[PDB]
Amino acid sequence: EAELSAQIRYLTQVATGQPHEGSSYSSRKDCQMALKRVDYARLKLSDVARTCEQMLEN
Amino acid sequence: SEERREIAEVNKKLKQKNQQLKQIMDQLRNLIWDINAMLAMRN
């Protein structure tokens, strides 16, 4: 009973609402469109290599 | 005599190579115009 009373008294006077402030996921996703831009550059250079391919045979 | 045929045939081959690298460096120009706006509004 004393443990229960101490548990509720330690948690008594902090009763209010809590805002999850800030957008950490918005800043976290800010690497991902740069990464897909890097992937766009990757497919661009892959197409550069594929255009380099056919002049080798002929 | 026939070296002139070689000159005439390789002149347009090196010009075609210059154009083939020209499209590639134009694509790289598009890439660098993409990348200079990245740091422009990074903050």
SSE pattern of chain B:
H
First and last CA, distance of chain B: 65 Å
Order of helices and strands of chain A: HHH
How many individual helices of chain A?
A: 3
What does the overall shape of chain B look like? rod-shaped
Q: Quote the beta fraction of chain A.
A: under 5%
Radius of gyration of chain B: 19 Å
Strand fraction band of chain B?
under 5%
> Radius of gyration of chain A in whole Å, from Cα?
29 Å
User: Residue share in helices of chain A?
Assistant: 55-70%
- Quantity of strands of chain A, as a count: 0
What's the overall geometry of chain A?
A: rod-shaped
Separation of the first and last Cα atoms of chain A: 90 Å
What does the largest sheet of chain B look like?
none
Largest sheet of chain A: none
Task: State the total count of DSSP E strands of chain B.
Answer: 0
Protein name (chain A): Mediator of RNA polymerase II transcription subunit 11
Family (chain A): Belongs to the Mediator complex subunit 11 family.
Subcellular location (chain A): Nucleus
Subcellular location (chain B): Nucleus
Describe the model.
This is part of a larger assembly, with chains A (58 residues) and B (43 residues). With 58 residues, chain A is mainly α. Chain A is 69% helix and 0% strand. Chain A is built from three helices and no strands. Chain A is rod-shaped, with a radius of gyration of 29 Å. Chain A starts with a helix and ends with a helix. The relative contact order of chain A is 0.06. Chain B has 43 residues and is mainly alpha-helical. Chain B is built from one helix and no strands. Chain B has one helix spanning 3-40. The longest helix of chain B has 38 residues, at 3-40. Chains A and B meet through α3 of A and α1 of B. It is classed as transcription. The entry lists the keywords Transcription, Mediator, MED12, MED13, CKM. The entry is titled "Structure of human transcriptional Mediator complex".
